[PDB]
Symmetry: D2
Subunit: 481 residues, 4 copies
């Protein structure tokens, strides 16, 4: 069965046909389109900036999530969780990105931009409407209550999204434990959902920063990372009309190993070209960025000793120099060193919060959101477009019905059953962007904060670099009538 990284690999395998009409032809197929929420005149962009993980380096699915899952389960068992966790196995059909974990009640929630509950799952049991009112009287959560609610926003969170559901299901059904509203009881030991969640969160961090996940990734890069020969071509085209920079949270050693792989072709920008080191594609390279803090105060600007991969002692005070690698600093480092203002910058990333929302809101940067799942989402949205149309029709009929003073009822049931049918085509937690006719929190933040978005940053290759990406003018309801 074809995953979303599979469709990315297919396109990644194909060479760049830069014939002008092949590009137009290519960029009307929606897989290869750049989609536009707010209008952007590429001619005015002076700096193209990049995230790395799941932006330049898309990890293959479900291999990477499975590996992260396996390593996280073993960290938990190693710290004392029960051995039965080792029989868990990652199932990519369950988790959708952007879910909310309620650490009070142990539910995964899919919500809209206002915190309305679209899906509620306790372990693997999907709680429906009336049952959810017992815990959510108004069917609503205050998502800015970040002490209770954790939003699982990155593809790095997909393993723990599934794992948390596994854990709830396990403790709920294992007779050694007694279920309570707020966690599980085994004699004089009480395990709250909240402390369960913290352990999972800690295990994921540890696996990434003290465990073996990076090691296992780098020793089988072909198994775990998508490679695309068109990347050096896109970056060198960008270098011709402007400056290119890298700003990543990862450290230098991991960044160097991953980026060496991403440029490991028998050629440079195009076949026949001398191969060039990955660093030569960037006017500025910054690691340990600590985004989103990076877009505020940031941290002290350091200089990487690239021979040892350690930071040099002290704050770096000097000029932008060929060959230098920076660590920490802030968004103002980029602006100062490349002589750019926020709106001269297109920053390309995959973290809707850490890359897009914060650079937009706090600095006025232009934004490009990479959504790796979009390839699969697009395939499903077109296949089952019929169901969405029926959903629209049923809503219009439901209105032209209330306006005539138990028919309104069978429609509401028909609406709920089409919604479910549509949602199941994406997975058990439904599409990334909606549940039926109701848009997700994630969808609404994409529209709000990503000026452009696409299945992959590479789709920029298919647009001339003076292109004006145009969204339609937005009208308030009273401006139409």
């Amino acid at each position: 069965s074809t995953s979303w990284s599979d469709r990315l690999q297919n396109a990644a395998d194909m060479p760049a046909n830069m014939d002008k009409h092949a590009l137009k032809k290519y960029r009307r197929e929606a897989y290869h389109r750049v989609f536009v929420n707010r209008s952007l005149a590429m001619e005015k962009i002076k700096c193209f900036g990049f995230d790395m993980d799941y932006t330049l380096a898309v990890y293959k699915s479900p291999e990477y999530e499975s590996l992260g899952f396996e390593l996280t389960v073993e960290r938990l068992v190693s710290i004392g969780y029960p051995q039965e966790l080792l029989s868990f196995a990652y199932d990519s059909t369950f988790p959708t990105r952007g879910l909310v974990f309620d650490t009070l009640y142990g539910n995964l929630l899919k919500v809209d931009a206002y915190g309305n509950l679209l899906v509620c799952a306790h372990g693997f049991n999907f709680i429906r409407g009336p049952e959810t009112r017992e815990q959510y009287p108004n069917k609503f959560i205050q998502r800015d209550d970040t002490e209770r609610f954790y939003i699982l926003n990155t593809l790095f969170n997909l393993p723990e999204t599934y794992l948390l559901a596994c854990l709830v299901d396990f403790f709920t059904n294992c007779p050694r434990y007694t279920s309570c509203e707020t966690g599980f009881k085994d004699g004089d030991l009480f395990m709250s959902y909240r402390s369960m969640f913290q352990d999972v969160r800690d295990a994921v961090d540890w696996v990434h920063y003290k465990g073996s996940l990076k090691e296992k990734t780098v020793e089988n890069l072909e198994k775990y990372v998508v490679k695309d020969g068109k990347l050096p071509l896109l970056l060198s085209r960008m270098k011709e009309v402007g400056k290119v920079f890298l700003a990543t949270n990862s450290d230098y050693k991991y960044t160097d190993k991953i980026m060496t792989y991403l440029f490991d072709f028998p050629h440079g920008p195009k076949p026949g070209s001398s191969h060039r080191p990955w660093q030569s594609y960037f006017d500025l390279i910054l690691v340990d960025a600590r985004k989103p803090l990076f877009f505020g105060e940031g941290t002290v600007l350091r200089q990487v000793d690239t021979k040892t991969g350690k930071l040099k002692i002290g704050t770096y005070t000097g000029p932008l120099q060929h060959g230098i690698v920076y660590s920490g600093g802030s968004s103002d480092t980029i602006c100062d060193l490349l002589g750019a203002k926020g709106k001269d910058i297109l920053y390309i990333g995959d973290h809707i919060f850490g890359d897009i929302l914060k650079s937009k809101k706090r600095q006025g940067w232009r934004t490009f959101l990479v959504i790796p799942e979009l390839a699969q989402e697009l395939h499903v949205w077109t296949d089952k477009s019929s169901l969405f149309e029926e959903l629209q029709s049923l809503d219009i009929f439901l209105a032209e019905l209330y306006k005539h003073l138990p028919d309104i009822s069978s429609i509401q049931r028909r609406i709920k059953k089409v919604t479910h049918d549509m949602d199941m085509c994406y997975g058990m937690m439904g599409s990334l962007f909606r549940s039926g006719s109701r848009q997700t929190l994630f969808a609404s933040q994409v529209m709000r904060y990503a000026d452009l978005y696409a299945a992959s940053f590479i789709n920029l290759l298919y647009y001339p670099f003076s292109y004006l990406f145009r969204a339609a003018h937005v009208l308030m309801p009273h401006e139409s009538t």
Copy 2:
């Protein structure tokens, strides 16, 4: 010249023709429409709640603003500002609602939802593009920097919007003062724009809470407050299908005097009916609400002694009782006492922040935004609809131009000149909702947080009370193509 309260008074004078087809006929004229951002099934609404000032009690314009202006200037002169302030006179053509005062540089700003500068005015001098980059390098402000930026969000802020521009203009041009980036210098006295702004803000508060403004309003209610005979009819219709409540920041004595006027007709809900006291229209009356805090922790629930208008000593712990008047409490007081959940409640108000955003985001209430200016805005938007169309056309042409590698230039100038022409038809600070093709912060918050909105809450009279207000389903760009 016809102000926005003038169009509200015209409709306010007309009797309710409750013939079913006259209502349909009436509610297709846009002045009398309820506009829909998100869909709402009125059948499911159990409680209708109300703000008072500029919701139930719309103050006549420009009389009320002029009075507030005059009293505020006299408070300033009385505390030491120069006597020339007394020659100021309120000019309603200057201020638009929702402007941002930059206390650092002394500018009034009209911004979009992202903080991009649409208009910059220093005193009465409109700073244009390149000049604004000197202070706004990226043409952008971080509007959540509430220590520097004050958003003038209510019609109560219209006098001080004009006054601040008056003050900057005066000090800038009076030779006793020397202009600096950050304020004005008169020998060894330095007056920052920030301290100037605080004085204005303080003077407005004082005028409202220790000055004579309330006194002068209540002694000529006919001069200062719109009255509508259809209000008791709307409220009694609401009482038939649900509960009605009042939740206002004003105190009991001012509330009683204003509401007595709003119901002061020789009849009750309709002509021929016995007149009823205003309190009998409400299942729950709450004053000193302290919104938006009201929608969080709130404050301690007190009980008003309605004979004296003072609070009884102690926290009120009892049941909802006929005749009782509440003070403070929280949104949960309403929910508890009327046995409602957030989505059973339609709260009707005019404070985009204090009434709508906070009740929506923090409690999941349904929202109705009253926008008194909308009558005038609608008259202008239709009159000069030609200019907006040309604006759309020029943007489409500007794109089909960049896509062909100094023509792009004269168009950009034509875009800037139509934008200006369009904006001047609303006033010197343009429409409440846009500058040309760019929507304002205010417009974007209306769309985001007001489920319904209208020139007046009374437009609900023209819709049957099982009506399903329907917005179109929203699609992301990739969902269309």
Copy 3:
């Protein structure tokens, strides 16, 4: 019966005999002594600074407290408290300064530096040991829990110290109310001790800043304020060896009226001298000081228009000028304008927190604490010195008793009965400085933060101005043996 302001008036009436040996003779009588906690070489002091209220202007007792009490009770009755409050009457024998009001349980507490309970009074009923453990299991309070505990530190707090005890007693014994652990219940109205306390606190503030207290004080200054002809003499002697400044929280108009009275004699510094305006005694005059904030960030430095008593608009940026009066600013204003460092400054005040602790800890100023009660305290401490000696003896015997494995018991009772006997000689809440052999919080803060202290600042007149006030070197226990 002779109050503490009475002994201050007696000394205030006597002329300055500046014969060198009369001064030595005078300053060995303890009423007129300056007492020394840490050593201070007056020769090194460059600036003498002053508080006004209860430092330069000592209010007569019990007239002033009675007036503040009467006006505070009437504010409460006027806001809705019951009429029986008007029969309350200030009783100076009850309150001691420095008591702690527990807003949770409605008790007045006398504590030591560690929060140990020395006295607990609910209304007028003194709770003893075992009964107090019901609410204070460890007989201890965390006095830095300023949300629950209010320390009544100034002589301005003496009326509300008594009033709070009156209120608790009244509600406790009035049959309309039902006592609970945390307040009082009258049907559906619950009045917590905490909300009771806030009303009292608010009523005191209001009386001082919006009521008639200042008016009534200034129209009978002879009834309410101690006057001393030796004050202009002390200040002019200080001006000869250094700079003098005034830094008070009171506003200019009240300060001017009070200081005019304090210098209203038919002469200047000494009899025969031309009278001089009070301002001529000060190198720097600062009102609206907002201490203790004054000793941190402070506030913006303003300049008083002394003709109108209003502040000039703007921040004052100029030099120290003859005749100028300052408002707000910070401790650094003094240091800058008088060219002094913290340890060149002796600041003389009566607020153990607002004047002494904060200037010492945050700025390293030298400190002089005025304790008006000390005259009365000294009279009592010497009269009943016998009881304290017996207290010492009983403790030594109690030790040489435990060290020999129900005798230890009758001693503990004898210790408790002498303690009570001693305490009652000062008033119902005992001495300011101790309960028996246990020092109060207040006493311990005097020793810790007041370099010098005295019944009145005027005692400095009796010491030559190169005098080295010497405390004994302090030794830790292991340094003696």
Copy 4:
């Protein structure tokens, strides 16, 4: 040369002679005395509680500090500091405990309780009076400014006290670096004193928690830890009259290894007794205490799996059980589980802040401070008692001199030279408790917050357990005269 752990080992070697008159004889020699700041009736103590590191487990000096120093220097060199650091070598004559590191200017400071500078050392250069005013205009620091000032309060801080001085000296004198007010410059790399200090701090933590320090300690316990056969005797005597508990920040595995060593004798409480496991001496054992947080909210109470040394999953909710080992929790865990109030508890520790100040102030616990250096301090204070007397005499003479209007000058120089002579007998940073006649911050906090204190907790063995430790009643200056 005899260090302070040397004198502790001598006493540690001697067997307990429990003859009643040998105990009296022993506890009058000051090495073996318990010193008394506030009176304490041991008869009333119900729970004896213990810290471990530098309380029960005193590390030998200078071996332990040298090892910590060596491992910390290697961590720094390993992270990039220059190789010359490896030639550093710990010098125990330099650092005194309780010094303040000013991260702004790179000075070590010895201060008094008010922040007055007693000693200022930049690297190894002792800055004197007038030179210090350049950076400390008022010769004073605000020690509660914990962002700038770090107080080196534990014997664990002795290596980094010396190291920081080494680092400043090195960078100051190495010609590769250019000295600035705030740090050091090497081309485009600027190393602030603050970032230098953070690295040192981080290196010490890392060495303790991820490095080899614990490993190296546990493999040569005889080299690094004082052992005393009288410890099991003291604890079992305590168990007879009350409950004993352990509350330590260290984890279970390190605690078990250290405590096994402390009880590793061929006998139990006394020679001839069966050996008992260290756990059997405690009614409650708590590790991972996280003091001082422990004395506030604390953390979640966990249960240690003593077989694996890992925590069991979940919060422990059960009763106090024989054999159970607790982790985290709060001071209230002790109180609940042992049924004690704060003043029934004597907690014995060496952290003046983390053990004594916080338990006293926040919980009202009785306190015993272990000061390992006191043995050496006592030896020096008695040897050079002559110099302190001369210091007293010179102060009295300096006063009887000012009181007679350049003699006052040669005395001030004589005072400064005796002070220096006295201080050098303790080390280059002087006594822990004073510089000449001025007490240190540390000394003043001992007097304020340690009810009892001693060179070792074992001195309690020499007092019968109904003993009343008596301090003299404290008198304010006016209470003497």
